[PDB]
Amino acid sequence: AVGIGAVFLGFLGAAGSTMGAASMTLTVQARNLLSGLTVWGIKQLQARVLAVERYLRDQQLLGIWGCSGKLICCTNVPWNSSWSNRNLSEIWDNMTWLQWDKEISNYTQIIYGLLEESQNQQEKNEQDLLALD
Amino acid sequence: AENLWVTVYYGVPVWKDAETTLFCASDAKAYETEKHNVWATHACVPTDPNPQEIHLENVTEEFNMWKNNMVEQMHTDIISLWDQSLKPCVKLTPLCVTLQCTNVTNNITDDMRGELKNCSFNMTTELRDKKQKVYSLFYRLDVVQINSNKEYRLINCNTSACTQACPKVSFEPIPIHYCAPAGFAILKCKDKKFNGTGPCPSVSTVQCTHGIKPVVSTQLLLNGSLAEEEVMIRSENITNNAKNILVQFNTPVQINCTRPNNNTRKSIRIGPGQAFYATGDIIGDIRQAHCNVSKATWNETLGKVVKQLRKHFGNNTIIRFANSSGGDLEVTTHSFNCGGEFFYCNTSGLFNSTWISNNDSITLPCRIKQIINMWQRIGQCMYAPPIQGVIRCVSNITGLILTRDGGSTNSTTETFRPGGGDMRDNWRSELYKYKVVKIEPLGVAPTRCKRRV
Amino acid sequence: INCTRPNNNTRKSIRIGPGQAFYATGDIIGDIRQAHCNVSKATWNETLGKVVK
Amino acid sequence: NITDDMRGELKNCSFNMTTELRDKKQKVYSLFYRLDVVQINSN
Ligand SMILES: *[C@@H]1O[C@H](CO)[C@@H](O[C@@H]2O[C@H](CO)[C@@H](O[C@@H]3O[C@H](CO[C@H]4O[C@H](CO)[C@@H](O)[C@H](O)[C@@H]4O)[C@@H](O)[C@H](O[C@H]4O[C@H](CO)[C@@H](O)[C@H](O)[C@@H]4O[C@H]4O[C@H](CO)[C@@H](O)[C@H](O)[C@@H]4O)[C@@H]3O)[C@H](O)[C@H]2NC(C)=O)[C@H](O)[C@H]1NC(C)=O
Ligand SMILES: *[C@@H]1O[C@H](CO)[C@@H](O[C@@H]2O[C@H](CO)[C@@H](O[C@@H]3O[C@H](CO)[C@@H](O)[C@H](O)[C@@H]3O)[C@H](O)[C@H]2NC(C)=O)[C@H](O)[C@H]1NC(C)=O
Ligand SMILES: *[C@@H]1O[C@H](CO)[C@@H](O[C@@H]2O[C@H](CO)[C@@H](O[C@@H]3O[C@H](CO)[C@@H](O)[C@H](O)[C@@H]3O)[C@H](O)[C@H]2NC(C)=O)[C@H](O)[C@H]1NC(C)=O
Ligand SMILES: *[C@@H]1O[C@H](CO)[C@@H](O[C@@H]2O[C@H](CO)[C@@H](O)[C@H](O)[C@H]2NC(C)=O)[C@H](O)[C@H]1NC(C)=O
Ligand SMILES: *[C@@H]1O[C@H](CO)[C@@H](O[C@@H]2O[C@H](CO)[C@@H](O)[C@H](O)[C@H]2NC(C)=O)[C@H](O)[C@H]1NC(C)=O
Ligand SMILES: *[C@@H]1O[C@H](CO)[C@@H](O[C@@H]2O[C@H](CO)[C@@H](O)[C@H](O)[C@H]2NC(C)=O)[C@H](O)[C@H]1NC(C)=O
Ligand SMILES: *[C@@H]1O[C@H](CO)[C@@H](O[C@@H]2O[C@H](CO)[C@@H](O)[C@H](O)[C@H]2NC(C)=O)[C@H](O)[C@H]1NC(C)=O
Ligand SMILES: *[C@@H]1O[C@H](CO)[C@@H](O[C@@H]2O[C@H](CO)[C@@H](O)[C@H](O)[C@H]2NC(C)=O)[C@H](O)[C@H]1NC(C)=O
Ligand SMILES: *[C@@H]1O[C@H](CO)[C@@H](O[C@@H]2O[C@H](CO)[C@@H](O)[C@H](O)[C@H]2NC(C)=O)[C@H](O)[C@H]1NC(C)=O
Ligand SMILES: *[C@@H]1O[C@H](CO)[C@@H](O[C@@H]2O[C@H](CO)[C@@H](O)[C@H](O)[C@H]2NC(C)=O)[C@H](O)[C@H]1NC(C)=O
Ligand SMILES: *[C@@H]1O[C@H](CO)[C@@H](O[C@@H]2O[C@H](CO)[C@@H](O)[C@H](O)[C@H]2NC(C)=O)[C@H](O)[C@H]1NC(C)=O
Ligand SMILES: *[C@@H]1O[C@H](CO)[C@@H](O[C@@H]2O[C@H](CO)[C@@H](O)[C@H](O)[C@H]2NC(C)=O)[C@H](O)[C@H]1NC(C)=O
Ligand SMILES: *[C@@H]1O[C@H](CO)[C@@H](O[C@@H]2O[C@H](CO)[C@@H](O)[C@H](O)[C@H]2NC(C)=O)[C@H](O)[C@H]1NC(C)=O
Ligand SMILES: *[C@@H]1O[C@H](CO)[C@@H](O[C@@H]2O[C@H](CO)[C@@H](O)[C@H](O)[C@H]2NC(C)=O)[C@H](O)[C@H]1NC(C)=O
Ligand SMILES: *[C@@H]1O[C@H](CO)[C@@H](O[C@@H]2O[C@H](CO)[C@@H](O)[C@H](O)[C@H]2NC(C)=O)[C@H](O)[C@H]1NC(C)=O
Ligand SMILES: *[C@@H]1O[C@H](CO)[C@@H](O[C@@H]2O[C@H](CO)[C@@H](O)[C@H](O)[C@H]2NC(C)=O)[C@H](O)[C@H]1NC(C)=O
Ligand SMILES: *[C@@H]1O[C@H](CO)[C@@H](O[C@@H]2O[C@H](CO)[C@@H](O)[C@H](O)[C@H]2NC(C)=O)[C@H](O)[C@H]1NC(C)=O
Ligand SMILES: *[C@@H]1O[C@H](CO)[C@@H](O[C@@H]2O[C@H](CO)[C@@H](O)[C@H](O)[C@H]2NC(C)=O)[C@H](O)[C@H]1NC(C)=O
Ligand SMILES: *[C@@H]1O[C@H](CO)[C@@H](O)[C@H](O)[C@H]1NC(C)=O
Ligand SMILES: *[C@@H]1O[C@H](CO)[C@@H](O)[C@H](O)[C@H]1NC(C)=O
Ligand SMILES: *[C@@H]1O[C@H](CO)[C@@H](O)[C@H](O)[C@H]1NC(C)=O
Ligand SMILES: *[C@@H]1O[C@H](CO)[C@@H](O)[C@H](O)[C@H]1NC(C)=O
Ligand SMILES: *[C@@H]1O[C@H](CO)[C@@H](O)[C@H](O)[C@H]1NC(C)=O
Numbered sequence: 001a002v003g004i005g006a007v008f009l010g011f012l013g014a015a016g017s018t019m020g021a022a023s024m025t026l027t028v029q030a031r032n033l034l035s036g037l038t039v040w041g042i043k044q045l046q047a048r049v050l051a052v053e054r055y056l057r058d059q060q061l062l063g064i065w066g067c068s069g070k071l072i073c074c075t076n077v078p079w080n081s082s083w084s085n086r087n088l089s090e091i092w093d094n095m096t097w098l099q100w101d102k103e104i105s106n107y108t109q110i111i112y113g114l115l116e117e118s119q120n121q122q123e124k125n126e127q128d129l130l131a132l133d
Numbered sequence: 134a135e136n137l138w139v140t141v142y143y144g145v146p147v148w149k150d151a152e153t154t155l156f157c158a159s160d161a162k163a164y165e166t167e168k169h170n171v172w173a174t175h176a177c178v179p180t181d182p183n184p185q186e187i188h189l190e191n192v193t194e195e196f197n198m199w200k201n202n203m204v205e206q207m208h209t210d211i212i213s214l215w216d217q218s219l220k221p222c223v224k225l226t227p228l229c230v231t232l233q234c235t236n237v238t239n240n241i242t243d244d245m246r247g248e249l250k251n252c253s254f255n256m257t258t259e260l261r262d263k264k265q266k267v268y269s270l271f272y273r274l275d276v277v278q279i280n281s282n283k284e285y286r287l288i289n290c291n292t293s294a295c296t297q298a299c300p301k302v303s304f305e306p307i308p309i310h311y312c313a314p315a316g317f318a319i320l321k322c323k324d325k326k327f328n329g330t331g332p333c334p335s336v337s338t339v340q341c342t343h344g345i346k347p348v349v350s351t352q353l354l355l356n357g358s359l360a361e362e363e364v365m366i367r368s369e370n371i372t373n374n375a376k377n378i379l380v381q382f383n384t385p386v387q388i389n390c391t392r393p394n395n396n397t398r399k400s401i402r403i404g405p406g407q408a409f410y411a412t413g414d415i416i417g418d419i420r421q422a423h424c425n426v427s428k429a430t431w432n433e434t435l436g437k438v439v440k441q442l443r444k445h446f447g448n449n450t451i452i453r454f455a456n457s458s459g460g461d462l463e464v465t466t467h468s469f470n471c472g473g474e475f476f477y478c479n480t481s482g483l484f485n486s487t488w489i490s491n492n493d494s495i496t497l498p499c500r501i502k503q504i505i506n507m508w509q510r511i512g513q514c515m516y517a518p519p520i521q522g523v524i525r526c527v528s529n530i531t532g533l534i535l536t537r538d539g540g541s542t543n544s545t546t547e548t549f550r551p552g553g554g555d556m557r558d559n560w561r562s563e564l565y566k567y568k569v570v571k572i573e574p575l576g577v578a579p580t581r582c583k584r585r586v
Numbered sequence: 587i588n589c590t591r592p593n594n595n596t597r598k599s600i601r602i603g604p605g606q607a608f609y610a611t612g613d614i615i616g617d618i619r620q621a622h623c624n625v626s627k628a629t630w631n632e633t634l635g636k637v638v639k
Numbered sequence: 640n641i642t643d644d645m646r647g648e649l650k651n652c653s654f655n656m657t658t659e660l661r662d663k664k665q666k667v668y669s670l671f672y673r674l675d676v677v678q679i680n681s682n
Contacts, residue, residue: 012318012338012572015146016191019578026144029574033144035315039213040176043156047314050153054316058575062143071143076586079137079579088134088579096191097145097576104577111139111577122586229604230661255662290659293605512605600667601659608656610669618641618649 011036019100020092026071033058061112066119076122077114083107137579144574151571152202153317157210158310158341169301171218172309172347180310180341186321189336196322198329198565199369203311207560211347212508222299223407225516229290230254235282237270241419244498248273249419252285256409259402267401269411274462275504289504295514300410304470306356308344313569322566325360329367329565345563349507350469351553352457352480354562357531359385364441367565371445377552378535379562385529386434390424390471390478392501392524410518424478424497426530431483431495438533439488451546453487456480463506464554467497471526475502475517484551508556532562589623648673 004024011032014022034055059068067073083104084091091100159177168175234252241249253268276285289295313319319342322333348356358381365381397413439452446452457465457480466477478499505515536552596612641649653668 010185010187012146012148012189013187015189022146023142026142028144029146029572030144033316033572033574038173038176039210039217040157043154044178047154047156051315058143061575062141065141067141067143073141073143074580074582074584075139075141076584077139079139084579088137088581091578097147098192100578101147101573101576108577115139115141226604227661229659231663286660290604291601598669600656600665602657604659610667612670614670616640618645620642620644 015098016096018093019095019097022097023072030071064119065115066122075115076118077111083111134581136583137581138583139577140580140582142576142578145576147573147576148318148570149573151317151569153314153569153571155203155206155311155313155569158312160308160344163307167303170303170305170307171215172307173214173218174307174309177309178312184339184341186337186339189320189338192336193332193334194320194322194336194568195332196327196330196566196568198367198561201561201564201568203564203567203569204557204560207311207345207564208557215507218302219296219298219515223297223409224294225297225409226294227257227403228409229287229294230256231279232271232276232285232287233282234271234276234285237419239419240417242421244421245419248500250276250285252276256401257403259405265401267411269399270413270415272501272503274500274502287504289514293512293514295504295516297409297516298518300518304473306346306348308346310341310344312341316572318570318572320568320570325362327566328365342564342567345560348469349556349559350467351463352467352534352551353469353530354532354534354559355388355469355528355530357381357529357562359383359531364437366438366441366445374537374539377558378537378549379558380438380533380535381562382434382531382533383437384434385531386426386430387527388424388426388530389527390422390476390499390525392422392471392474393420394422395523396519396521398519398521412519422476422499422501424476424499425494426483426497428493428495435486436488446547449490449545450543451487451489453546453548454484455548455550456484457551462500463509464552466500467551468553472524473517473520474524475505476500477502480551484549509554534558587623587625589621591621592619593621650676652676 006025009025009028011028013028014025034051062068062070062073065073065075067075157174157177158180159174161179161182163170163174163177164179232252232254234250236247237249237251238246250271250273251268252271253266256265256267258265275288277288278285287295311319318338319340321337321339323335323337324333327333346356348354360381360383362383364383367379367381369376371378395416397416399411399413401409401411403409435454442452443450459465462477467480468475468477470476476499478497480497482495482497503517503519505517506513507515534551534553535549538548538550540546540548594615596615598610598612600608600610602608650671650673651668652671653666655664656667658665
C-alpha cells in the first residue's frame with residue numbers, strides 16, 4: 001500500500017520534524033542499530049564488540065521496565081509537573097526530539113528508577129493474585 | 134489533559150558528540166593485482182558501489198574544524214601503514230663505511246657543479262670470507278666529509294641505519310573511505326560558504342566519507358578538492374599570527390615537473406638473498422630538475438586570494454608575499470614525491486609580489502635526495518632506490534598554507550610567507566566537513582495513555 | 587632498613603654502532619668503600635621475640 | 640685508595656670495540672665487578 005504517504009524515508013530522516021511526526025518512523029532507526037593482525041585487524045573487531053554491547057545494554061533497560069519487544073510502551077508512572085509544565089499540544093506539535101532531550105536531560109535518571117520499581121510492584125502483585133487462585 | 138503518564142519510545146532520532154574508531158574501505162578495482170602499494174588496501178573492506186546519503190531538513194549543527202579526532206586517527210593510521218610496509222625489506226647496516234669520493238665533472242652545466250659525487254668502497258659478498266670493491270653515485274646532500282679524493286660517509290651513520298624501500302612497492306596515492314561502526318554516524322556540512330567553524334545550516338548524514346588521497350607535500354596542496362563558489366580562507370584565529378592559514382582554490386593550477394637525466398641502475402649482492410641498488414653512469418648530459426607553472430594563471434589566482442584576504446584586514450591595506458624565512462630543507466622548500474623520486478623545489482619565484490589597495494612560465498629549480506626522514510621523526514630513515522630512465526609528472530595545485538608576520542601597530546602592510554611542516558594540516562584540508570556522532574535511541578515523554586492492569 | 591652505596595660513580599658513553607651506545611663505568615671520584623645496610627638492634631630483637639612467642 | 644675489604648672486588652679491563660663505521664675499531668676500557676668476569680686459560 002501507500003503506507004503513510006511520505007516524501008521519503010531514511011535513517012535519521014525525521015530529525016528536524018515535530019515529535020508527533022517523527023514517532024511514525026521508529027522502525028527506520030531501530031533496524032539500523034545492529035549492522036546498518038594488520039593495522040585494520042582489531043579496528044574491525046573492537047568496533048563490532050562495542051556495538052553488540054551497546055545494543056544489549058539498551059535492550060536490558062526495556063526488559064526490566066516491562067516494555068520488552070515493543071517500540072511504544074505505556075507505563076503506570078504519573079508525570080510530574082516539576083520536570084516540565086508545558087502543554088500537551090506544544091510538546092507533540094511544536095518541538096523536536098533533539099530539543100526535548102536538552103530540556104529534560106537533568107531528570108532522566110530520576111524517571112528511570114520509578115519505572116523499575118513500578119514493574120517490581122506489578123510483578124509481585126501479579127504473583128500474589130495468581131497464588132490466590 | 135492533566136492525567137499525563139510516562140510513555141517510553143525506542144528509536145527516536147537524537148545523537149551526541151563522541152569519539153570512536155573508524156575503519157577503512159577501498160574500491161574494488163584496487164584488488165586487480167596492484168598488491169604492491171604502500172597503502173595496504175588488501176585488508177580494506179570493499180566499498181559500496183552505490184553510497185547512500187540522507188538529507189536532514191530543518192537541522193542545524195555545530196562544527197569545529199580544528200578539534201576533530203578524525204584527523205588524529207587518520208594521521209596515526211597513515212604512519213602505521215607506512216611503517217608496516219617497510220618491515221619485509223633490506224636493512225642497510227653494512228653500508229655505513231668509509232667512502233672515497235670525487236667530483237663528477239663530465240658534461241655538466243654550471244649549475245650542477247659539486248652536486249654529484251663518484252664514490253668507491255669495500256663491500257661484503259654472499260660469502261662471509263671475501264669482499265668486493267664497488268662504486269656508486271651519491272648526491273651531495275647525502276654525504277658528509279670526515280677528518281685528494283677526501284673520505285666521506287653517509288649522513289645518517291651517527292643516528293640510525295636506513296631501510297631500503299622494496300623496489301616492487303609503489304608510492305602512488307589511492308583513495309580511501311572512512312566508515313563508522315553500527316550505532317554511530319557521520320554528519321556532513323553541505324554549505325558552500327562554510328568557513329570551518331560555527332553552525333552549519335545545511336546538513337546530511339552518510340556512512341562513509343568520499344575518497345581521500347593521502348598526498349604528502351609542504352607549502353602546496355596537490356591533487357585535492359576545489360571550492361565550489363569562491364576562494365576560502367580558514368584559520369583557527371585570524372587575528373593571531375601564530376596560527377596557520379589554509380587557502381582553498383576555486384580552480385586548479387597546473388604544475389609540470391621532470392628529472393631530465395637518463396639514470397642507470399646497478400644490482401650489488403651484499404649477502405645471501407639481499408641486494409643493494411646502486412646508481413651506475415648517466416647516459417648523456419647532466420642537467421638540473423625543475424618545475425613549471427604558468428605565469429598568468431598564478432597571477433590570477435594570487436589576485437583572487439588577495440581580494441578574499443582583504444575582508445579580514447580592510448580595503449586600504451598593502452598585501453605582499455615573501456619566501457620562507459628559514460629552517461631545515463623540509464620546511465623551506467616545496468617537498469613532494471613524483472613517481473619514486475623525492476623533490477625539494479625552491480618556491481621563491483612564486484611568492485614575490487606586492488599589491489596596492491587600489492605565454493611564459495616560471496621555473497622552480499629543485500634538488501633530489503635519497504635518505505628520507507618522514508613524519509618529522511628522529512632515528513628512522515629510509516633509502517629510496519634509483520629509478521631508471523627519465524621522469525615526468527603532472528598535477529594540480531589546489532590550495533596553500535600561509536603564515537603572517539607580527540607587525541607593530543597597523544603599518545598598513547601585511548606580509549605572508551609559505552610554511553608547512555606538520556602533516557596534520559594536510560588531512561585537515563579534506564576532513565573539514567565531517568564529524569562523528571553517537572545515537573541515543575531511547576526517549577520518554579508524557580501522554581494520556583495508561584497501562585492496563 | 588637503610589641501605590647505601592658510598593661510591594661516587596662516573597658514567598661513560600661508547601658508540602658501538604649506528605644509533606647504539608654502551609654505558610660504561612669510568613673512574614671513581616674519591617675513596618672506595620663497601621656497600622651495606624643498617625637495622626636497629628633493639629627493634630629487631632623485639633620483633634624476633636614476638637615471632638618466637 | 641681502597642679499604643682492606645674491597646680488595647680484588649673491582650677490575651680495570653680494556654678491549655677492542657666496533658665503531659659506527661664498519662671498517663675501523665676503537666680501544667676502550669671500563670670497570671667491572673669481580674662477580675661478572677671469568678678467567679680463561681701479568682694482566
Ligand atoms: C597527481 O595526480 C596525477 C595523476 O593521477 C599523478 O600523475 C600520475 O603519476 C603516476 C605515478 O607515477 C603515473 O603513472 C606512471 O606512469 C608512467 C608513465 O607511463 C605513462 O605512459 C604510458 C604509455 O603512454 C601509459 O601506458 C601509462 O599509463 C602512463 O600514462 C609509468 O611508467 C608508470 O608505470 C611504472 O611505475 C608503476 C608504479 O611504480 C609500476 O607499477 C609499473 O609497473 C611501471 O614500473 C615498471 O616499468 C618501469 C618502466 O619500464 C620500470 O622502470 C619499473 O622498474 C617497473 O618495471 C606509472 O604507470 C601517471 O602517468 C601520472 N599521470 C600523468 C597524467 O602524468 C601525480 O603524481 C599526482 N601528484 C602527486 C604529488 O602525487
Ligand atoms: C678496501 O680494501 C683495500 C684492501 O684492504 C684497501 O687497500 C689498502 O689500503 C691501505 C690504506 O692505505 C693500504 O695501506 C698502504 O699501502 C701503501 C702501499 O703499499 C703503503 O705505502 C702505506 O704505507 C700503507 O701501508 C694497503 O696497501 C691497501 N691494500 C691493497 C691490497 O691495495 C682500500 O683502502 C679499501 N678501501 C677502498 C675504498 O678500496
Ligand atoms: C686490540 O687490537 C690490537 C691491534 O690488533 C691488538 O694488539 C696486537 O696484539 C698482538 C698480540 O700480541 C700483537 O702481536 C704481537 O706483537 C708483538 C710486538 O710486535 C710481537 O713481539 C709478538 O710476536 C706478536 O706478534 C700485535 O703486535 C698487536 N698490534 C698492535 C698494533 O699493537 C690487541 O691485542 C687487541 N686487544 C686489546 C685488548 O688491545
Ligand atoms: C670538487 O667539489 C668541491 C665542492 O664539493 C670543491 O670544493 C669547494 O668546496 C667549498 C665548500 O663547499 C665550496 O664553497 C667551493 O665553491 C668549492 N670549490 C672551490 C674551488 O673551492 C672542489 O674545488 C671541487 N674540485 C675538486 C678538484 O675537488
Ligand atoms: C666513477 O669512477 C669509476 C672508477 O672508480 C669510473 O668507472 C671506470 O672508468 C674508467 C675510465 O673510463 C674505465 O676505464 C673503467 O673501466 C671504469 N670502471 C671501473 C670499475 O674502473 C666511472 O666512469 C666514474 N663515473 C663518472 C660519472 O665519472
Ligand atoms: C567563521 O564564521 C563564524 C561565524 O559563522 C565566526 O565565528 C563568530 O565570530 C564572531 C566574530 O568574528 C563572534 O562574535 C561570534 O561569536 C562567532 N560565532 C561562533 C559560533 O563562534 C568565525 O570567526 C569565522 N572564522 C573565520 C576564520 O572567518
Ligand atoms: C585570537 O587572537 C587574539 C590576538 O592574539 C586574542 O586577543 C588577545 O587576547 C589576549 C588575552 O589572552 C590579550 O592580552 C591581547 O591584548 C589580545 N589581542 C588583541 C589584538 O585583541 C584573542 O583572544 C584570540 N581569540 C581567542 C578566542 O582566544
Ligand atoms: C636512456 O638510455 C637507455 C639506454 O641507453 C635507452 O634505451 C635504449 O634506447 C635505444 C634507442 O636507440 C634502443 O636501441 C635500446 O634498445 C634501448 N635499450 C638499451 C640500450 O638497453 C633509452 O632510450 C634512453 N632514454 C632517453 C634518451 O630518453
Ligand atoms: C619548462 O620550462 C622550461 C623553460 O622555462 C622549458 O625548457 C625549454 O625546453 C625546450 C625543450 O627541451 C628547449 O628547447 C628550451 O631551450 C628550454 N628553455 C630554456 C632552456 O630556456 C621546459 O621544456 C619546460 N618543461 C618542463 C617539463 O620543465
Ligand atoms: C604541462 O604539460 C602539459 C602536457 O600534458 C601541457 O599541456 C599541453 O600544452 C601544449 C601547449 O604547447 C598543448 O599543445 C597540448 O595540447 C597540451 N596537452 C594537453 C593534454 O592538454 C601544459 O601546457 C604544460 N604546462 C606548463 C605550465 O608547462
Ligand atoms: C631560491 O631561488 C632564489 C632565486 O633564484 C635564490 O636567491 C638568489 O640566489 C642567488 C645565488 O644563488 C643570488 O645571486 C640572487 O641574488 C638571489 N636572488 C635575489 C632576488 O637576490 C635563493 O638563494 C634560492 N634558495 C636557496 C638556494 O635556498
Ligand atoms: C623578485 O622580486 C625582485 C624585486 O623586484 C626581483 O629582483 C630585481 O629587482 C630589481 C629592482 O628591485 C629589478 O630592476 C629587476 O628587474 C629584478 N630582477 C629581474 C630579473 O628583473 C626578482 O627578479 C624577482 N624574482 C625572483 C626573486 O625570483
Ligand atoms: C587536474 O585538473 C584537471 C582540469 O580540471 C582535471 O582534468 C579533468 O578531469 C575530469 C575527470 O576526469 C574530466 O571530467 C575533465 O574533462 C578534465 N578536464 C579537462 C579540461 O579535460 C584533472 O582530473 C585534475 N587532476 C589531475 C590532473 O590529477
Ligand atoms: C660526585 O662527583 C661529582 C663530580 O666530581 C660532583 O659533582 C660536582 O660537585 C662539585 C662540588 O664542588 C661542583 O662544583 C661541580 O659543579 C659538580 N659537577 C661536576 C664537577 O661535573 C658531586 O658533587 C660528587 N658527589 C659527592 C661527593 O657526593
Ligand atoms: C650505618 O651504620 C654505620 C655504622 O654501623 C654508619 O657508619 C658510620 O658513618 C659515619 C658517617 O660517615 C662515620 O662517621 C662513622 O665512623 C661510621 N661508623 C663506623 C665506621 O663504624 C653509617 O653511617 C650508617 N648509615 C648507613 C646509611 O649505612
Ligand atoms: C635510617 O635513616 C633515617 C633517615 O630518614 C633515620 O631517621 C632519622 O634518624 C635520626 C637519628 O639520628 C633522627 O634525628 C631523624 O629525625 C630521623 N629522620 C626521620 C625523617 O625520621 C633512621 O634513624 C635510620 N635508621 C637506622 C637504623 O640507621
Ligand atoms: C689481584 O687480585 C687477585 C685476585 O682477584 C690476586 O690473586 C689471588 O687470587 C686468589 C684466587 O681468587 C685469591 O685466593 C688470593 O687471595 C689472591 N691474592 C693472592 C695474593 O694470592 C692477586 O694477587 C692480586 N694482585 C695482582 C698483582 O694480581
Ligand atoms: C684503568 O686503566 C686506565 C688505562 O688502561 C687508566 O686510565 C689511564 O690512566 C693513566 C694513568 O694516570 C693516564 O695517564 C691515562 O691518561 C688514562 N687514560 C688512558 C686512556 O690511558 C685508568 O685510570 C684506570 N682506572 C683505575 C681506577 O685504575
Ligand atoms: C516533582 O519534582 C519536584 C522537584 O523536581 C519535587 O519537589 C516534587 O515533589 C515532585 N512531585 C512529584 C514527584 O509528584
Ligand atoms: C496551554 O493550555 C492553556 C489552557 O488551555 C492555555 O491557556 C495556554 O495558552 C496553552 N499554552 C500553550 C498551548 O502553549
Ligand atoms: C540542568 O542542571 C544544570 C546544573 O546541574 C543547569 O545548569 C541546567 O540549566 C539544567 N538544565 C535545565 C534544562 O534545567
Ligand atoms: C599581475 O596581474 C595584475 C592585475 O591582475 C597586473 O597589474 C600585474 O602587472 C600582473 N603581473 C604581475 C607580475 O603582478
Ligand atoms: C634481646 O631481648 C631479650 C629479651 O627481650 C634479652 O634477654 C636479650 O638480652 C636481648 N639481646 C639479645 C642479643 O638477644
